[PDB]
Amino acid sequence: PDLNSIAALRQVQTRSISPENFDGTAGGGGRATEGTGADCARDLGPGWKISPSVDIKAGETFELASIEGAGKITHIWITTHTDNWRTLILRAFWDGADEPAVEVPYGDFFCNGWGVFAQVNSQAIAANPHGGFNSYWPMPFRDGARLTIENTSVVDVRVYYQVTYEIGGDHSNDAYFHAQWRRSNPLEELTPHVILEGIEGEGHYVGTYIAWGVNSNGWWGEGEIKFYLDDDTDHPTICGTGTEDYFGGAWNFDIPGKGYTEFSTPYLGMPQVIRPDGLYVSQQRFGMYRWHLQDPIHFATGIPKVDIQALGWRSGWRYLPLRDDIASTAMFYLDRPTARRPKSPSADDMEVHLGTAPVPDLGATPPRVL
Amino acid sequence: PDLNSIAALRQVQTRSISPENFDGTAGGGGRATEGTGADCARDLGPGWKISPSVDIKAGETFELASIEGAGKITHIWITTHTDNWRTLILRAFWDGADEPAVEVPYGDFFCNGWGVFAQVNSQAIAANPHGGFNSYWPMPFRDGARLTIENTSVVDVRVYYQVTYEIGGDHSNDAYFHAQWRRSNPLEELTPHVILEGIEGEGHYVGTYIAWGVNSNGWWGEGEIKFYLDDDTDHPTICGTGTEDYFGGAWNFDIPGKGYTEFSTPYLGMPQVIRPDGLYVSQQRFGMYRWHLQDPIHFATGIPKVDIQALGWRSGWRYLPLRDDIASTAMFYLDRPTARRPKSPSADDMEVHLGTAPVPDLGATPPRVL
Amino acid sequence: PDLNSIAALRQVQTRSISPENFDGTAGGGGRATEGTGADCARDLGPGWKISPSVDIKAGETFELASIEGAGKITHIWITTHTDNWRTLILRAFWDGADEPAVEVPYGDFFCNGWGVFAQVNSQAIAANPHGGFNSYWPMPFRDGARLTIENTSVVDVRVYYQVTYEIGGDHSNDAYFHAQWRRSNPLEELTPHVILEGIEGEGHYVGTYIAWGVNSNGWWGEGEIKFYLDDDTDHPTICGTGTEDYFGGAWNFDIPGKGYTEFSTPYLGMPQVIRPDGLYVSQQRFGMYRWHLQDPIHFATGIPKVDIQALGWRSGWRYLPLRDDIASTAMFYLDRPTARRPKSPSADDMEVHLGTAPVPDLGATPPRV
Amino acid sequence: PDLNSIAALRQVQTRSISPENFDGTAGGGGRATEGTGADCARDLGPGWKISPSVDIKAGETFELASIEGAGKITHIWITTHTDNWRTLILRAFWDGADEPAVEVPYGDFFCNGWGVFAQVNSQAIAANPHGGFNSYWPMPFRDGARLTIENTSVVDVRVYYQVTYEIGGDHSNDAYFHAQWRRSNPLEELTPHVILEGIEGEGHYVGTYIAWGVNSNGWWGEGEIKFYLDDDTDHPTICGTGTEDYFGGAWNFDIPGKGYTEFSTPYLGMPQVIRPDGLYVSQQRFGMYRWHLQDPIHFATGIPKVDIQALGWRSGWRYLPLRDDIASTAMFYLDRPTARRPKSPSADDMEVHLGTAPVPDLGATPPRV
């Protein structure tokens, strides 16, 4: 429900999967006698926070949640240290499918793909101090749900999480939640950055998060977003007017006398502006989201292409093709649990620089000395 | 309705009770010739802000709103000076019930339990400069409604209010809105702070505001929330992983280089961080809220217990049971107009220090000096 | 002697026990070839700071001093790191007794019960940069003395110390030095904090140090101190008028426009004000001492009770009973080497949070991790 | 006793007189059911700070302490709001005498004659935040003692106090404590300010506190102190070399690059420097004390005169006789309970401006409007 409909009596059950209730059973929480907090509770009884988190060994995948039957995820809360935001891969599989519908680097799913905490005050995503990541995207499913997180790094990783969902609804006409990630670094000359390609089915596009690192001086966001829907081949159905325009800003996000200004509204934001520090943090980077909740982009047959140009300015008032560092996360609902995906994100494609030192390992927490 | 459904035509009437229209009648507003504004308008006349507020004498209860028939409150606005935020009790009675379904200290109901204004940008609660307290919790009723505000303080109190409601909808399947408040100060050793106890009926839990003052050094919010629903006894169905975790945050609310950081999002917030001033304002305090609107916690026959652990840190990585000052406000919808309640809040249990002086009466507005 | 009487020739001997002369014997100092400094002097010979300190293993007790016969301790210097100020227990045993007359956490004995250095300029106690702890309380004894320090913590600790004493002169009529510790956290509703209880004998009360952490807003120091002496039962002989009053301050220690002001005088002080930093050091705390040296509180048959009220302010000009964090150290002289004392301090009720980080182990030196 | 002698056992009783124990009797404290704190304790039970203070109505005198028999006051603690430091007169009468031995404005007794708080860390006098006034001057008597506070102001005042004393000692060769006050505003030209005059008996001079407000530019402390003792007539036995000199400073109290510097040591101090604010607080004022404790100034048959010159500088390296505002408090011990005194201080001669506003009533707490 929502504020408007919260009062209606509904025959629904609410369940919640955490490290204190791995399977989310009724009456099954807080029973652990082993866990990451056991030694901490050694002078207290059982039931005093024995199992708040899990450790995922380097290279391994952990099953956050396994649900049987029909249901709908209504709220995901999760945290881990910033160092892992671009080493963990978050995946969701609906209805027993062998391929995931959601396959995203952890940080980007919460508009935090740079490993530097940015506050996000939106409706679908809340990202709160410090690295408290919340997803309210409804994720309904008809015949099972699997959520996993893969630690592609060389170090062991600690993760806290809480997956809340509903049982007892009819999801026969609910679509499946999908999310996909692509990174161009550096984008090829005069080539749009692909956001989505080759999606088949009925559904609607509902979200874009972009992490953009700029390699040219001047304004970098002239490029237009383009939605090729259904029958479209060589020209899109929805064509935009700029990068900041798409994300609801205008005129370079530039408030006279203040510069680039972070903002974060229910459907539109640029929650992140990273400014170089004159030493080893040398890349100017941006994070921007737009949710199409009141204005979804429906498609009856498919989405052949969603892409966005990367244009700035050069002398003589000419557009400048940008060789920039662009990562997109596209959110969409579909009447199937799988669709064409890009190649799985590798450790190497995902990597951003860890700290503020000259070497990632020197600014990791704690530093890595080998 | 909401933004998505606001265009639809509906056979519904809107009414609003205020000191300028005490009973809400149509054509009934602005007729006062006596009131708190009458002398202010002695050179004007009737119709020029004659009756904007009410004066509630010390000890006495004022009936904000009496409504007959079926209806639904859609928006409450109310204000009063900060000195009264923890001396007034807000109450709501549905369907002619002898007992209140809402029984809350005034400030807590708007996430402001400490008497120090804090901005709240949430969906259900908006608290604005300076002490503009707004509630958008829908409160449906089938056979009448009464709202009251009790002045438990030794001074007369001024209150402005605007209670907006609808007539003409079907509430036979709408739950009733409830809210309950409990404070433990200091929390007993090894004792979860009880948020909600013994609720019988069908319904769903939708909101927590906690006012927390900390009596140990170090981090204070390791403790987990536990929801015992339906048949639960010894173990909860939903077990949390931490106090900041439950409220959408992570890692102590601690942004590196900034410390505790206030935030306020549609469903999650720590709107308030009170820092000691090194003189008479010596208690470090927090206010936190979570609304379970997209993700309500349902129950079919009851809520035996909701509670939250108060755990900090001791040497040797040991949880420290905290003897802290913890006040909780719990919001839930129920299919009955009454339910098991804590003891009624009293002047002594609600009291927080007034102002910044060594004596509450010195810092009151105006100073009492009696 | 003192400044007034220092010129007099006296048939007295001065000795001094330190890690460089463990038994304090004439000509016994500086002989070590092993000790905590030996390797530091590997390129120098012996006699170059070979044994300046001792290491005390986790859990273990170390005998600082053992003196045979009659004497008087005249000055104790001692130091150790911040993290050990509320983990070490200092004890003194007089005349071969099995029960100690002094049983006090290390830091409280030098007005430093919070593990944060505060300068103390008093006559009996001098606490100097950084953690140079000095006691000049004279401690006479007739038939032996033992000083011990117990490491109740889980780590090993370094201690430097120097215990200076005198042999000669009659302690026929010199009382014994006693010191006892009690902490209420949180204090019971509307209940005085006990400072001293059930003491029997002849003597005089000479010292109070209190470490006070406040859990209510407003002014916390209205409570009066009360001395029940000799035949007293339900009412005291000496009844104070406030907490800051007892400690020689007034009007909340609050100098207008500057707030709480630390001071330290020969007999009266508030040497420590700890203000919260708005992050993990969230407790506002105080350190206060009064030495009754020119104005001893005598008793002839005992001290039934010494207590102090914990009172602040509530709405309506009402006292507010304070559920506060109060630790007291009482100093008194007694005509017996033993007295009835509280339950020994444990590691747990002594513990104060270490450092400024979210977990004590993260703020320890070095971090425990 | 003191630190050097604190350990000795002594057949002495300690008593303390306060608003909570008006007569100091054993088992007598904390019994009140009426008092200034009774309404404050209305929600608590008996014994919770019912009687911590006294209200002295405008114009009236209040008897702080009345003691019968032999005894010795060992410590006085007292406080009241700064507005009253120069409207209250503190008096002490020994052995039933009809005239006081101590007759001093309240603030001056504690080196605070200007109504602006100044820390004093001295041996005999401790003045602590904010207005905690402490005297450790021992005051022996042989046949009773009376301590009074006179409120010469037109408003009611609140006082908190604690008078601690001993019984048991033999005071038959203990002198009586005396203190006297004299103000010259403005001092007549080329006329020494009289500190003490015509004292008859055996004793010793033990203290000077001077409150000095300067009405000429340049350095104001050239003038030197003179003690006329015993058979002295036209010339003194002790002749000092300067005003800062007498108070233990040198070269104008002026540290290069810092100006006048406050300091408070066990016997010597300039605890107070008051700098004009450029508006209504326009008088540059100083507070200075010297205790002659280790160096008492002895007399066998009396003190004809103690005085001090007020000399500054004019052009041509000539002394400038100063028309200055000089109040002194002389402490001395005498073998008699009474001595020759100045006129009692009046409200008008004691008055100092209250606050910082144009009119004293506007700067009082609260304003008298």
Author numbering:
A (entry chain L), B (entry chain K): 2 to 371
C (entry chain A), D (entry chain G): 2 to 370
Publication text:
The crystal structure of ExoMA1 was determined at 2.42 Å resolution in the apo form. ExoMA1 monomer has a double jelly-roll fold, which was found only in GH172 among over 160 GH families. The active site is located at the interface between the two subunits of the basal trimer. One phosphate molecule per monomer was bound to the interface of ExoMA1, which is responsible for dodecamer assembly. The dodecameric structure of ExoMA1 is formed by the interactions of four loops above the double jelly-roll fold, whereas the C-terminal helix is mainly involved in the hexamer (dimer of trimers) interactions in αFFase1 and BACUNI_000161. The corresponding residue in ExoMA1 is Asn253, and its side chain blocks α-d-Fruf binding, making the enzyme specific for α-d-Araf. ExoMA1 hydrolyzed the terminal α-d-Araf structures of arabinooligosaccharides released by EndoMA1 and EndoMA2 but did not act on MsLAM, A22BβT, and A7Bβ.
In this study, we identified four enzymes (two GH183 endo-d-arabinanases, GH172 exo-α-d-arabinofuranosidase, and GH116 exo-β-d-arabinofuranosidase) from Microbacterium arabinogalactanolyticum.
